């Protein structure tokens, strides 16, 4: 009936030391076919050959895998060969290869030390997945402030996929900021900085709640201060604070205190709770040229003489922009045969909406000027009838094309942000197309989602057949993480409207969540459109913590526990977080593990490789307007399936009409016994098939917030992350 | 560089001209680098505006020259590999490369810009590199080449000459000695043997109205066709024979007598390729070491004769004359050191 | 007066590509070369935007 | 080139950085040749006048 077809998909940024998977459609006649994606290096010889029998209209996904290579990085020719009994297809491109870097990192016992103390830290190995691997390390070492490598441990191996080390410092070794660092077989290097110094233990974090954000239209300001302590108790004493504008009218150079207007407030901590203050922003002149606010709050804790400060909410921007609407579910695209709708939001200032404020729509080259308002959330839904021209660029505003108060005096600092967004459209010489209404917001995990799509089929099966398939893919992490399918029995010759899908959010999928899906024509053409979902920091191997409750009066018998996979392991941390009140730790979250990676996302092919240029130029001697007058030659600019799948991050092989029919340029030319503070737990545990409960033992006269950290591992599930059991 | 090869092979080389040429080389190299494409390709201007796409043929010429410059002096492999992938990117699954024309003149070039000949000059300049004849790209090229040869051959005309001989050479690279000698014989079909040597032309006149003066769009391309033939008969896997080298020498005589007194030859293309072929001629024949020849000629009529050829008398010519109406003249030579002998 | 200048050329089909004038003959031009002028509402002029 | 010396002396060296800097150096050498005087001397600009 229709034409015989195929399609096969894969990233461009390969990896090594594991398998990396692509997928394949075949379909349509003499389907007793085979394939092989031949990865064959260009210079010399090599071949990671792979072969496969080819069925029809099915997505089985094979995952070949990769050894190391001679060079670190290289191109690689991929070439596919297909052989049906009466059909075939051989097609090639280039691919990136990379004798990778395993993203690896440290956890330490401390972010600080004192004289005579002892380091205690750990490290991690990984693959693409966070299913760890066993390998051997060249070295990991320590570095003094002065380049003086202060010790060594060498030639160790990872079977745990972590390992744990130690070292004793001497009596008066180097002050300043120490450094602990590694390197790899390839030479990749990585740290975990910290300091050694001296300090009295703080039993109090001065803490406040004061605007992150004052803005232009603010006449005074709210101020509030709160002294947490041992145990979060309320503290007495005296406090003084400095709400401060910066970088004053003086020159700042060697005779001029750049610290601009500091308004100083003296508070006396009452018996319980919090001192409060309402502060006037007149004297800061929250106006044209005076700089971001910095705010320093300092508690003279009584009966101790101690004070410390926290620069709270340093990054306050008193931004000229105000009534700052924001796009949220702003589509990137639109079509000439669809009712689309950017579902749109508004917010102001601090980050909160107003309800019931009128605004003006602007439809430019679709000629849709209009008016609308705010709801409880400032959430609005314009929606537009579309029989218009290619390039559309859109906005709605609450003010007009000028800065209404004293715009161009060069001395004024007020603005209304205005909506800005560009959207493009598909090419589809069928004039059939798709376009989707995503769930464009913060994606949960531990759930799934159904995903509505809108299918427009001019002619559909022109001759073809009554049935047609639907094929969706979710890669992430430059990988492939899930996949599946659907279809529908096609109405003869109309444009049937709506249906949706499901997809789960178990794990294995990065903060990315790309989706595409494409519904083919056996004629030899296809459509399909993209997606994107802000996955949240979610993991394969689940874990939390639990413990025998809080107990003062150092009862030594005292437990702690975790749930985790049945044959597993954990690496753990406790701290009396007094020293670690004085200073935080550094970026210890599952998001850290995520963002350390090689190529979190992949959009766009890599550098060296360029494209997959085609020969099919179409330039007429002149465009041939039989009619009004001959319109000349020039290019276009619109979106493409090729472009959808490259912005996806990847490439495929077909012969469908994917890339636009782009054309050649112009050829023609010219009771208590002190046990050790500043550490409680640094030890290791295995996970039986019912969970551990270790007895981490009580410790005297050390009374505070005690965060405590957990890490775990397994071959079958992965790494380990969960929050703080404050066994205060 | 093929000149330096001439010097080295024939041994006529001082370090002075050698250093002169070296400076020349480095300079021309880098002046070339200023005209490239960041993909790896080359155009006549290129840089300072990305309002172009580079040519291919140029880049292949570049690739070859880069190869030989590597063969003596230092040069970056990065650039050959980039131009190589660029060629591939201008490859079709089944069809050949395309004349992505961005040139200025054509007498620089020694063909008709036929896509197959284009691809052919490419792949042959490739396989002169250390290349696996089983490589993917070149396998595809060879399918092009083979199909192309068939249509050239069974059809009465396929340009009849040069297409065909360049095909001969790439076939020579393969291992396809059978195809090699076959198309070799097809070249000998329209053979142009002379009083004392041979050659080929293009088909002796272009049939259409042509010429008038200045070789307009037609640089007569008469030598490089023979140069690659001088590779064609020559180069193989194990070592060569009599017949190959006899025909070689014939055209070599055609070549050197076709050499121009101003310097070089009619162009740069022919000049390069002739020098390459002559260099490898010597690189086989001219044994700078082989120095102990000895000979006897014996006729049944006992017209004896004895000679010697040695480095001290290397370009010597010990002629000797011959009265017997019947020839009975049995040659015999020995020892080391190559000899070309001629009688009439 | 009749200007048919589209904001963009609306070149329906595969892609969009700009506009320019023609150079062709006209009744208008036949009658101008002829020698004369006429009054008439019809479509004689090429609708030169 | 004193960097290369360092790279070779202290032994921390690969052929790849080597090749890179070789290309660099032939290049900068020639670019310098384009600033000489025919006597042999050099200048900020030199050639072309
Ligand atoms: C000219 O280029 C050659 C490379 O082709 C440079 O190396 C030379 O390579 C030739 C091989 O053709 C060597 O000759 C060899 O002689 C040995 C016996 O000693 C023999 O067993 C081999 O079969 C071969 O014939 C030659 O030794 C070698 N170097 C020379 C010629 O001294 C050569 O350095 C270049 N000459 C220059 C730069 O002037
Ligand atoms: C790197 O720079 C050196 C110059 O310092 C270049 O020549 C090298 O010189 C060293 C001596 O510093 C040579 O080492 C020698 O080892 C032998 C034992 O085999 C010993 O008897 C000598 O006393 C000396 O220590 C070395 O052989 C020589 N060449 C090398 C290092 O390969 C060298 O060419 C430079 N390398 C480059 C070009 O990167
Ligand atoms: C191909 O690569 C292999 C890898 O060791 C090497 O041994 C071989 O020489 C190369 N070429 C051929 C023809 O096998
Ligand atoms: C296989 O597909 C071709 C392509 O349309 C078709 O014409 C043929 O009937 C099918 N079966 C064969 C070639 O035996
Ligand atoms: C600020 O504090 C006052 C009371 O002093 C309270 O009425 C108000 O809600 C707080 N927030 C403001 C004014 O932004
Ligand atoms: C916007 O237009 C609507 C009509 O739909 C009108 O009710 C409203 O008053 C207009 N907005 C303003 C600023 O008046
Ligand atoms: C939107 O308005 C246009 C006006 O041309 C109309 O053609 C179209 O039918 C409307 N949308 C729908 C879904 O009918």
Q: How far is A661 from chain C (nearest CA, A)?
A: 8
What b-and-e string marks burial along B26-48, b requiring 16 or more CB atoms within 10 Å of the CB?
A: beebbeebeebbebbbbbeebee
The helix/strand/coil state of A611 is: coil
Alpha-carbon distance of B40 to B83, in angstroms, equals: 5
Residue with tokens 């874990």: A543
Q: Chain centroid to CA B19: how far?
A: 26
Residue with tokens 């899908």: A501
Say whether A75 and B53 touch across the interface (CB within 8 A): no
What contacts B255, CB < 8 A, 6 or more positions away? B223, B226, B227, B230, B274, B278
What contacts B11, CB < 8 A, 6 or more positions away? B286, B288
Tell me which residue of A128, A188, A68 sits closest to A597, measured CA to CA.
A128
Ligand 3 atom closest to the Cα of residue B132 is 13
User: Which protein residue has the closest C-alpha to ligand 7 atom 11?
Assistant: A385
| Token pair listed for A261 | 């207007």
What contacts A214, CB < 8 A, 6 or more positions away? A221, A281, A286, A293, A316, A318
Q: At what angle do helices B177-189 and B136-154 cross, to 10 degrees?
A: 30
CA atoms within 13 A on the CB side of A357: 17
- What chain A residue is nearest to C3 in terms of C-alpha separation? A628
Residue with tokens 């010519």: B317
Q: How far is A613 from chain B (nearest CA, A)?
A: 7
Largest Cα–Cα distance in chain C? 44
Tell me which residue of A696, A677, A721, A688 sits closest to A200, measured CA to CA.
A677
Alpha-carbon distance of A162 to A158, in angstroms, equals: 6
The alpha carbon of A323 and the centre of ligand 6 are apart by a number of angstroms equal to: 19
At residue B220, φ and ψ (nearest 5 deg) are 75, -10
- What chain D residue is nearest to B30 in terms of C-alpha separation? D27
- A328: which DSSP letter? E
Contact at 8 Å (CB) between A233 and A203?
A: no
Alpha-carbon distance of D30 to B30, in angstroms, equals: 8
- What chain B residue is nearest to D34 in terms of C-alpha separation? B27
Say whether C20 and A628 touch across the interface (CB within 8 A): no
Apex A241 CA angle, A240 and A243, nearest 5: 160
Contact at 8 Å (CB) between A191 and A181?
A: yes
| Token pair listed for C47 | 């609708």
Q: Which residues pair with A501 in a beta bridge?
A: none
What are the CB-based long-range contacts (under 8 Å, 24+) for C33-42?
Answer: none
At residue A321, φ and ψ (nearest 5 deg) are -65, 135
DSSP letter for each residue of A70-104: SSSEEEEEEEEEEE-SS-EEEEEEEEEEE------
Q: Describe the strand order of the beta sheet including A23-27 as a list of residue ranges.
A: A23-27, A5-11, A650-653
Nearest ligand atom owner, CA of A397: 6
Contact at 8 Å (CB) between A174 and A146?
A: yes
By Cβ distance, the residue of A42, A613, A669 closest to B84 is A42
- What chain A residue is nearest to C23 in terms of C-alpha separation? A629
Helices and strands per DSSP (H, E), number in chain C: 1, 0
Largest Cα–Cα distance in chain A? 105
Q: How far is D23 from chain B (nearest CA, A)?
A: 7
| Token pair listed for B132 | 């696996």
Alpha-carbon distance of A105 to A592, in angstroms, equals: 10
- A113: which DSSP letter? B
Contact at 8 Å (CB) between B6 and B256?
A: no
The helix/strand/coil state of A646 is: helix
| Dihedral sign for Cα atoms in the order A634, A635, A638, A641 | positive
In terms of phi and psi (left: phi > 0; alpha: psi -120 to 50; beta: otherwise), the region of A607 is: alpha
What contacts D48, CB < 8 A, 6 or more positions away? none
Alpha-carbon distance of A228 to A213, in angstroms, equals: 23
| Token pair listed for A15 | 């990896």
The helix/strand/coil state of A222 is: strand
Alpha-carbon distance of A570 to A445, in angstroms, equals: 23
Residue B205 vs residues B84, B163, B201, B229, D10: alpha-carbon distances, Å: 36, 17, 9, 21, 68
Alpha-carbon distance of B265 to B257, in angstroms, equals: 10
A410 lines ligand 4 (CB under 6 A): no
At residue A576, φ and ψ (nearest 5 deg) are -70, 105
Alpha-carbon distance of A265 to A299, in angstroms, equals: 11
What contacts B290, CB < 8 A, 6 or more positions away? B335, B336, B337, B338
- Contacting partners of chain D (3+ CB pairs under 8 A): B
| Token pair listed for A326 | 């924001």
Residues lining ligand 5, judged by CB closer than 6 Å?
A 222, 278
Q: How far is B35 from chain D (nearest CA, A)?
A: 14
User: Which protein residue has the closest C-alpha to ligand 6 atom 13?
Assistant: A358
Tell me which residue of A662, A666, A645 sits closest to A93, measured CA to CA.
A645
Alpha-carbon distance of A470 to A487, in angstroms, equals: 4
Say whether A42 and B88 touch across the interface (CB within 8 A): yes
The alpha carbon of B73 and the centre of ligand 2 are apart by a number of angstroms equal to: 21
| Token pair listed for B89 | 């990117």
> How many CB atoms are located within 10 Å of the residue B205 CB?
9
Apex A582 CA angle, A577 and A588, nearest 5: 60
Alpha-carbon distance of D44 to D35, in angstroms, equals: 7
Q: Which residues of A touch B81 (CB under 8 A)?
A: 42-43, 75
Nearest ligand atom owner, CA of B287: 1
Task: List all residues of chain C from 10 to 39 with a beta carbon under 8 Å from chain A.
Answer: 10-11, 14-22
By Cβ distance, the residue of A389, A429, A635 closest to C7 is A389
Tell me which residue of B82, B91, B81, B83 sits closest to B140, measured CA to CA.
B91
Alpha-carbon distance of D33 to D48, in angstroms, equals: 12
Q: How far is B243 from chain D (nearest CA, A)?
A: 45
What are the CB-based long-range contacts (under 8 Å, 24+) for A166-173?
Answer: A166/A118, A166/A119, A166/A120, A167/A118, A167/A119, A167/A142, A168/A118, A169/A113, A169/A115, A169/A116, A169/A117, A169/A118, A169/A119, A169/A196, A170/A116, A171/A115, A171/A116, A172/A115, A173/A144
In terms of phi and psi (left: phi > 0; alpha: psi -120 to 50; beta: otherwise), the region of A308 is: beta
Q: At what angle do helices B224-232 and B242-258 cross, to 10 degrees?
A: 160
Nearest ligand atom owner, CA of A386: 7
Does A635 touch chain C if contact means CB atoms closer than 8 Å?
yes
Alpha-carbon distance of B249 to B256, in angstroms, equals: 10
Say whether D22 and B74 touch across the interface (CB within 8 A): yes
Alpha-carbon distance of B270 to B108, in angstroms, equals: 9
Contact at 8 Å (CB) between B3 and B274?
A: no
- A448: which DSSP letter? E
- Contacting partners of chain A (3+ CB pairs under 8 A): B, C
What's the alpha-carbon Rg for chain D, to the nearest Å? 15
- What pairing do the DSSP bridges indicate for beta strands A650-653 and A516-521? unpaired
Ligand 1 atom closest to the Cα of residue B287 is 25
Say whether B137 and A77 touch across the interface (CB within 8 A): yes
| Token pair listed for A316 | 């306050």
Q: Describe the strand order of the beta sheet including A380-381 as a list of residue ranges.
A: A326-329, A343-345, A380-381
Our mutation pick for probing the ligand 1 site, out of B2, B8, B287, B337, counting the most ligand atoms within 8 A of Cβ, is B8
What b-and-e string marks burial along B231-253, b requiring 16 or more CB atoms within 10 Å of the CB?
A: bbbbbeeeeeeeebbebbbbbbb
DSSP letter for each residue of A515-567: -EEEEEETTTEEEEE-------S--SS----B-S----TT-S---EEE---SS
Helices and strands per DSSP (H, E), number in chain D: 2, 0
Alpha-carbon distance of C23 to A622, in angstroms, equals: 13
H helices present in chain B, as ranges: 2-10, 15-33, 57-72, 77-89, 115-127, 136-154, 162-174, 177-189, 224-232, 242-258, 269-284
Tell me which residue of A107, A60, A22, A153 sits closest to A573, measured CA to CA.
A107
Contact at 8 Å (CB) between A433 and A527?
A: yes
Tell me which residue of A143, A136, A27 sits closest to A89, measured CA to CA.
A27
The alpha carbon of A337 and the centre of ligand 7 are apart by a number of angstroms equal to: 9
Alpha-carbon distance of B179 to A15, in angstroms, equals: 42
Alpha-carbon distance of A559 to A547, in angstroms, equals: 6
Ligand 5 atom closest to the Cα of residue A222 is 1
The helix/strand/coil state of A9 is: strand
Residue A5: which H helix or E strand, with range? Answer: strand A5-11
The alpha carbon of A44 and the centre of ligand 3 are apart by a number of angstroms equal to: 7
The alpha carbon of B4 and the centre of ligand 1 are apart by a number of angstroms equal to: 14
Tell me which residue of A30, A27, A10, A19 sits closest to A80, measured CA to CA.
A10
> How many CB atoms are located within 10 Å of the residue A196 CB?
20
Alpha-carbon distance of B281 to B296, in angstroms, equals: 25
Say whether B27 and D19 touch across the interface (CB within 8 A): no
Q: How far is A465 from chain C (nearest CA, A)?
A: 26
What contacts B277, CB < 8 A, 6 or more positions away? B227, B228, B230, B231, B234
Contact at 8 Å (CB) between B338 and B288?
A: no
A399 lines ligand 6 (CB under 6 A): no
Burial bucket for residue B325 (CB in 10 Å: 0-12, 13-18, 19+): exposed
3-state secondary structure A242-292: EEEEECCCCCCCCCCCCCCCEEEEEEEECCCCEEEEEEECCCCCCCCCCEE
Say whether B30 and D26 touch across the interface (CB within 8 A): yes
Tell me which residue of A707, A722, A706, A712 sits closest to A688, measured CA to CA.
A712
| Token pair listed for A540 | 């394969």
| Dihedral sign for Cα atoms in the order D25, D31, D35, D39 | positive
Which residues in A382-479 belong to E strands, given as ranges? 392-397, 421-423, 433-436, 448-449, 453-456, 467-474
Alpha-carbon distance of B65 to B18, in angstroms, equals: 17
Q: How far is A388 from chain C (nearest CA, A)?
A: 9
| Token pair listed for B17 | 């001209």
What b-and-e string marks burial along A563-601, b requiring 16 or more CB atoms within 10 Å of the CB?
A: ebbeebbbbbbbbbbbbbbbbebeebebeebbeebebee
A358 lines ligand 6 (CB under 6 A): yes
Residue A162: which H helix or E strand, with range? Answer: strand A162-168
Apex A216 CA angle, A214 and A222, nearest 5: 30
Does A530 touch chain B if contact means CB atoms closer than 8 Å?
no
What contacts A6, CB < 8 A, 6 or more positions away? A24, A25, A26, A27, A54, A82, A89, A653, A654, A655
Contact at 8 Å (CB) between B280 and B234?
A: yes
Our mutation pick for probing the ligand 6 site, out of A356, A357, A358, counting the most ligand atoms within 8 A of Cβ, is A358
Alpha-carbon distance of A673 to A244, in angstroms, equals: 46
Residue with tokens 């802000």: A534
By Cβ distance, the residue of A38, A612, A667 closest to B101 is A667
| Token pair listed for A701 | 């006269």
Nearest 10 degrees: Cα torsion B5, B8, B12, B17: 70
What contacts A670, CB < 8 A, 6 or more positions away? none
Apex B264 CA angle, B262 and B266, nearest 5: 85
A492 lines ligand 4 (CB under 6 A): no
Alpha-carbon distance of A200 to A301, in angstroms, equals: 14
Q: Do chains B and C touch (3 or more CB pairs under 8 A)?
A: no
Residue A238 vs residues A225, A660, B297: alpha-carbon distances, Å: 11, 72, 124
Our mutation pick for probing the ligand 7 site, out of A366, A368, A387, counting the most ligand atoms within 8 A of Cβ, is A387
| Token pair listed for A232 | 């979060």
Alpha-carbon distance of A213 to A319, in angstroms, equals: 9
Does A619 touch chain C if contact means CB atoms closer than 8 Å?
no
Contact at 8 Å (CB) between A612 and A658?
A: no
| Token pair listed for B3 | 């000149």
Q: Describe the strand order of the beta sheet including A467-474 as a list of residue ranges.
A: A482-489, A467-474, A516-521, A525-529
By Cβ distance, the residue of B26, B74, B78 closest to D30 is B26
Q: Chain centroid to CA A398: how far?
A: 32
Say whether A631 and C4 touch across the interface (CB within 8 A): no
- What pairing do the DSSP bridges indicate for beta strands A5-11 and A23-27? antiparallel
| Residue pairs spanning A and B at CB distance below 8 A | 46
What are the CB-based long-range contacts (under 8 Å, 24+) for A605-610?
Answer: A605/A12, A605/A96, A605/A646, A605/A651, A606/A12, A606/A13, A606/A96, A608/A75, A608/A96, A608/B82, A609/A12, A609/A75, A609/A94, A609/A95, A609/A96, A609/B85, A610/B39, A610/B89
Query: Counting every residue, how long is chain A?
Result: 728
Q: To what resolution in angstroms was this structure determined?
A: 3.9
Apex B194 CA angle, B190 and B200, nearest 5: 35
CA atoms within 13 A on the CB side of B136: 29
Method of structure determination: cryo-EM
Apex C15 CA angle, C11 and C20, nearest 5: 45
Our mutation pick for probing the ligand 5 site, out of A222, A274, A280, A281, counting the most ligand atoms within 8 A of Cβ, is A222
């Amino acid at each position: 009936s229709g034409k015989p077809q195929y399609m096969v998909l894969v990233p461009s940024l390969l990896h090594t030391e594991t398998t990396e998977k692509g997928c394949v459609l075949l379909s349509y006649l003499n389907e007793t076919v085979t394939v092989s994606a031949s990865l064959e290096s260009v210079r010399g010889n090599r071949s990671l050959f792979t072969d496969l029998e080819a069925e029809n209209d099915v997505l089985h996904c094979v995952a070949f895998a990769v050894p190391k290579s001679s060079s670190n990085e290289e191109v690689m020719f991929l070439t596919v060969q297909v052989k049906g009994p009466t059909q075939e297809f051989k097609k090639r491109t280039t691919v990136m290869v990379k004798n990778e870097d395993s993203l690896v990192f440290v956890q330490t016992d401390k972010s600080i030390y004192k004289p005579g103390q002892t380091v205690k830290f750990r490290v991690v190995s990984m693959d693409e997945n966070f299913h760890p691997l066993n390998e051997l390390i060249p070295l990991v070492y320590i570095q003094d402030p002065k380049g003086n490598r202060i010790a060594q441990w060498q030639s160790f191996q990872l079977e745990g996929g972590l390992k744990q080390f130690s070292f004793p410092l001497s009596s008066e070794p180097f002050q300043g900021s120490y450094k602990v660092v590694v390197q790899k077989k390839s030479g990749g290097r990585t740290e975990h900085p910290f300091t050694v110094e001296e300090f009295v233990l703080p039993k109090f974090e001065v803490q406040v709640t004061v605007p992150k954000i004052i803005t232009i239209l603010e006449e005074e300001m709210n101020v509030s201060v709160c002294g947490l302590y041992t145990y979060g108790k309320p503290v007495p004493g005296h406090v003084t604070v400095s709400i401060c504008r910066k970088y004053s009218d003086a020159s700042d150079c060697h005779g001029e205190d750049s610290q601009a207007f500091c308004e100083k407030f003296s508070g006396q901590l009452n018996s319980h709770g919090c001192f409060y203050q309402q502060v006037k922003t007149k004297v800061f002149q929250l106006k044209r040229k005076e700089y971001e606010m910095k705010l320093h709050t300092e508690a003279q804790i009584q009966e101790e003489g101690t004070v410390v400060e926290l620069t709270g909410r340093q990054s306050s921007e008193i931004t000229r922009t105000i009534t700052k609407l924001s796009f949220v579910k702003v589509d990137s695209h639109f079509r000439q045969g669809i009712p689309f709708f950017g579902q749109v939001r508004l917010v102001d200032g601090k980050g909160v909406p107003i309800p019931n404020k009128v605004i003006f729509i602007r439809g430019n080259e679709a000629n849709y000027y209009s008016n609308a308002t705010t709801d409880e959330h400032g959430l609005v839904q314009f929606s537009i009838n579309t029989t218009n021209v290619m390039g559309t660029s859109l906005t709605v505003r609450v003010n007009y094309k000028d800065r209404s108060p004293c715009y161009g005096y060069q001395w004024v600092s007020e603005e209304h942000e205005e909506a800005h967004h560009t959207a493009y459209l598909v090419f589809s010489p069928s004039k059939s197309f798709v376009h989707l209404e995503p769930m464009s917001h913060e994606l949960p995990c531990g759930h799934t989602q159904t995903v509505q799509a809108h299918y427009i089929l001019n002619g559909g099966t022109l001759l073809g057949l009554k049935k047609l398939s639907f094929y969706y893919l979710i890669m992430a992490k430059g990988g492939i993480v899930r996949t599946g399918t659907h279809g529908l029995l096609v109405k003869q010759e109309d444009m049937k409207g709506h249906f949706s899908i499901s997809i789960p959010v178990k794990s294995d999928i990065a903060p990315v969540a790309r989706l595409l899906i494409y519904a083919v024509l056996p004629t030899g053409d296809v459509i399909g459109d993209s997606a994107k979902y802000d996955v949240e920091n979610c993991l394969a191997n689940k874990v939390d913590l639990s413990f025998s409750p809080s107990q003062s009066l150092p009862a030594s018998h005292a437990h702690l526990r975790v749930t985790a996979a049945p044959q597993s392991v954990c690496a753990l941390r406790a701290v009396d977080q007094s020293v670690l009140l004085m200073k935080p730790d550094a970026e210890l979250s599952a998001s850290s593990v995520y963002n350390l990676l090689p190529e979190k996302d992949l959009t766009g092919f890599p550098g060296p490789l360029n494209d997959q240029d085609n020969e099919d130029c179409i330039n007429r001697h002149n465009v041939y307007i039989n009619g009004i007058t001959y319109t000349p030659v020039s290019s276009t600019n619109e979106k493409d399936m090729y472009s959808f799948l490259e912005d996806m991050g990847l490439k495929a092989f077909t012969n469908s009409k994917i890339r636009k029919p782009k054309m050649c340029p112009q050829l023609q030319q010219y009771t208590v016994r002190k046990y050790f503070p500043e550490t409680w737990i640094w030890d290791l545990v295995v996970v039986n098939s019912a969970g551990v409960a270790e007895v981490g033992v009580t410790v005297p006269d050390t009374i505070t917030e005690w965060k405590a950290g957990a890490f775990c591992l397994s071959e079958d599930a992965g790494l380990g992350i969960s929050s703080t059991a404050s066994l205060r | 560089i093929y000149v330096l090869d001439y010097l080295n092979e024939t041994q006529q080389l001082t370090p002075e001209i050698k250093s002169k040429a070296i400076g020349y080389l480095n300079t021309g190299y880098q002046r070339q680098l200023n005209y490239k494409h960041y993909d790896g390709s080359y155009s006549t201007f290129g840089e300072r505006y990305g309002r172009n796409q580079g040519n291919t043929w140029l880049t292949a010429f570049v690739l070859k020259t880069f190869a030989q410059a590597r063969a003596y002096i230092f040069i970056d492999e990065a650039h050959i590999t980039q131009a190589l992938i660029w060629l591939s990117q201008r490859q079709k699954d089944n069809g050949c490369f395309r004349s992505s024309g961005s040139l200025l003149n054509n007498a620089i070039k020694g063909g008709v810009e036929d896509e197959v000949t284009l691809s052919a000059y490419i792949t042959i300049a490739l396989l002169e590199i250390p290349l696996t004849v089983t490589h993917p790209v070149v396998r595809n090229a060879l399918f092009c080449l083979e199909s192309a040869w068939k249509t050239a051959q069974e059809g009465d005309h396929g340009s009849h000459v040069y297409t065909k001989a360049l095909l001969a050479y790439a076939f020579a690279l393969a291992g396809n000695q059978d195809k090699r000698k076959e198309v070799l014989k097809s070249l000998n079909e329209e053979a142009v043997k002379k009083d004392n040597s041979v050659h080929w032309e293009r088909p002796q006149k272009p049939k259409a109205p042509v010429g008038h003066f200045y070789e307009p769009q037609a640089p007569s391309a008469e030598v490089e066709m023979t140069s690659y033939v001088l590779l064609a008969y020559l180069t193989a896997q194990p070592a060569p024979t009599s017949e190959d080298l006899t025909s070689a020498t014939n055209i070599v005589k055609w070549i050197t007598k076709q050499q121009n007194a101003q310097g070089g030859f009619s162009s740069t293309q022919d000049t390069v390729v002739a020098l390459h072929a002559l260099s490898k001629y010597g690189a086989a024949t001219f044994t700078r070491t082989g120095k102990a020849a000895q000979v006897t000629i014996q006729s049944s009529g006992t017209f004896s004769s004895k000679f010697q050829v040695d480095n001290n008398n290397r370009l010597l010519l010990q002629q000797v004359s011959l009265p017997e109406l019947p020839g009975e003249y049995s040659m015999k030579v020995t020892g080391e050191g190559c000899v070309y002998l001629q009688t009439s």
